[PDB]
Amino acid sequence: FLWMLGQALVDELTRWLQEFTRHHGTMSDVLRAERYLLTQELLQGGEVHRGVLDQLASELLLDRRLRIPELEEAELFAEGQGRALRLLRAVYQCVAAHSELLCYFIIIL
Amino acid sequence: ELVKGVYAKYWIYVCAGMFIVVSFAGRLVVYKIVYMFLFLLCLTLFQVYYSLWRKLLKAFWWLVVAYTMLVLIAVSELFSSILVPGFFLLACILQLHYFHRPFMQLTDMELELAAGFSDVLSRVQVFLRRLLELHVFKLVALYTVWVALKEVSVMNLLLVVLWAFALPYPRFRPMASCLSTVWTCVIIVCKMLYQLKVVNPNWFGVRKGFPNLGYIQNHLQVLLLLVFEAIVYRRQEHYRRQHGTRQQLDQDLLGCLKYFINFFFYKFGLEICFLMAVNVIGQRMNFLVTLHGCWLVAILTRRHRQAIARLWPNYCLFLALFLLYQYLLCLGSTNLISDFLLLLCASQQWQVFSAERTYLDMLKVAVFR
Amino acid sequence: LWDCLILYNVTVIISKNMLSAGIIWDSVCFFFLLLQRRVFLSHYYLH
Numbered sequence: 306f307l308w309m310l311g312q313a314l315v316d317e318l319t320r321w322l323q324e325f326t327r328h329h330g331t332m333s334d335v336l337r338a339e340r341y342l343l344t345q346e347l348l349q350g351g352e353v354h355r356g357v358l359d360q361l362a363s364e365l366l367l368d369r370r371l372r373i374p375e376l377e378e379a380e381l382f383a384e385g386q387g388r389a390l391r392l393l394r395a396v397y398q399c400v401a402a403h404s405e406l407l408c409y410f411i412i413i414l
Numbered sequence: 415e416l417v418k419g420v421y422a423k424y425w426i427y428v429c430a431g432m433f434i435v436v437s438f439a440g441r442l443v444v445y446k447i448v449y450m451f452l453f454l455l456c457l458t459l460f461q462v463y464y465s466l467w468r469k470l471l472k473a474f475w476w477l478v479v480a481y482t483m484l485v486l487i488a489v490s491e492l493f494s495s496i497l498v499p500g501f502f503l504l505a506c507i508l509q510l511h512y513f514h515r516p517f518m519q520l521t522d523m524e525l526e527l528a529a530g531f532s533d534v535l536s537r538v539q540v541f542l543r544r545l546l547e548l549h550v551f552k553l554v555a556l557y558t559v560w561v562a563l564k565e566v567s568v569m570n571l572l573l574v575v576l577w578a579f580a581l582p583y584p585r586f587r588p589m590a591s592c593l594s595t596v597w598t599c600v601i602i603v604c605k606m607l608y609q610l611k612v613v614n615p616n617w618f619g620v621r622k623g624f625p626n627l628g629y630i631q632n633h634l635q636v637l638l639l640l641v642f643e644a645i646v647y648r649r650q651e652h653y654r655r656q657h658g659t660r661q662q663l664d665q666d667l668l669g670c671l672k673y674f675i676n677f678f679f680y681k682f683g684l685e686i687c688f689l690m691a692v693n694v695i696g697q698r699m700n701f702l703v704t705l706h707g708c709w710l711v712a713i714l715t716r717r718h719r720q721a722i723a724r725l726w727p728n729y730c731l732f733l734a735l736f737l738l739y740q741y742l743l744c745l746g747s748t749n750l751i752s753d754f755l756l757l758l759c760a761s762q763q764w765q766v767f768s769a770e771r772t773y774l775d776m777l778k779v780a781v782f783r
Numbered sequence: 784l785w786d787c788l789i790l791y792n793v794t795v796i797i798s799k800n801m802l803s804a805g806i807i808w809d810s811v812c813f814f815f816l817l818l819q820r821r822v823f824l825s826h827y828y829l830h
Binding site for chain 1 (some may be wrong): 783
């Protein structure tokens with residue numbers, strides 16, 4: 306069906322976009338996985354710095370931690386909606402990686 | 415047969431319709447009051463007891479006797495009179511004969527899945543109807559429309575001396591409503607005899623009740639609205655007589671929704687009032703709204719919500735007095751409705767400020783980053 | 784800084800009241816400014 310074809314192509318697109326953002330994605334796993342979070346709810350943060358930078362050369366391994374406070378906490382809903390939402394997630398990652406190129410495009414446009 | 419008891423209870427509204435045909439017929443003055451508006455004042459009687467809702471039977475008993483007397487004395491035209499009020503006296507005398515109780519001495523205070531959802535929804539709405547959401551806001555909205563934006567001058571007693579002081583101080587919010595019923599009943603009584611009898615043109619912004627239908631056509635609408643609110647109130651008053659705060663928040667989307675549906679004005683009310691003042695400013699742009707705007711600056715330069723809370727009784731006072739002045743300026747408008755909205759909102763925030771206060775992570779990502 | 788931006792917005796609306804263009808957009812701004820000023824929490828925004 307036409308619908309089914311589009312679904313497959315969306316997933317193909319996610320893959321292609323992930324291939325483009327690959328390097329930046331891994332640079333955001335050795336840094337931003339232990340950086341940006343915004344999921345902690347309730348009141349304030351008890352162990353302030355231990356709850357972020359010390360949590361869970363280009364591709365690092367088991368230097369810091371494993372996955373103690375759920376590495377896949379982020380990957381839960383992320384992979385939960387592998388269709389639609391993830392297409393836009395991949396789009397953002399691409400433009401975050403290639404923001405220099407985005408600027409250039411806008412100025413000539 | 416549930417309908418047997420339903421129709422034994424159905425006599426008040428049945429009479430109302432017959433008093434509507436008694437209205438605009440027979441005596442333009444007397445008939446209307448005696449039948450329709452004295453039954454509407456008997457409604458007020460049981461409401462003003464605040465304990466005898468639909469239990470007052472003494473006066474409601476003699477309402478029938480008064481109507482029988484009228485028919486016995488008097489009611490094409492001999493025949494008209496007869497037929498017409500017998501038609502309502504028939505129903506009235508029937509209550510006196512039997513089943514006066516279901517409506518007056520019984521309702522007292524002392525299918526499948528889809529249908530299941532339907533009845534739940536009925537009751538949630540009515541819960542909001544028995545909440546301040548309906549008990550007050552909707553009533554005063556229609557009041558302002560049918561007083562300020564409608565017949566001005568002498569309807570100030572039905573608004574700027576009532577709701578302009580009842581909104582800030584909710585102690586007399588229900589008393590105000592009962593008095594309102596009484597006063598508009600009085601207003602229709604007065605306009606019944608129009609004003610064209612030997613006009614020799616004391617001064618209170620005399621607009622004069624020249625039309626018949628159109629002129630009687632709005633005060634009765636708010637009279638009925640009071641009645642409707644009272645009905646839904648006393649319904650759930652006897653449904654209660656007989657018959658998540660920050661925890662649901664972090665659950666999910668349903669939790670967030672629930673929290674705010676129940677606690678919007680609880681927290682947002684202050685920011686609301688600030689924006690309602692801007693609304694008034696924009697839908698006016700006169701010199702009168704410089705006063706509203708000056709007060710806005712004052713309460714916005716108070717920053718900390720605790721300091722705004724001690725400036726709140728004076729803000730609410732200003733708003734109330736301003737509504738009164740605005741009328742006395744229009745008598746002795748849409749701008750009046752805007753100042754009413756601001757008053758209503760800020761009054762509710764005065765009743766919260768020093769009272770009640772004393773996948774969803776992606777959504778939180780948006781607002782909170 | 785946010786409160787000073789709020790005051791700027793207020794003064795724009797209040798000076799437009801004393802006219803002698805519209806406050807519609809300035810009221811949208813007021814809403815958003817008030818929203819953000821509020822969301823500067825010591826809890827969720829502290830995160």
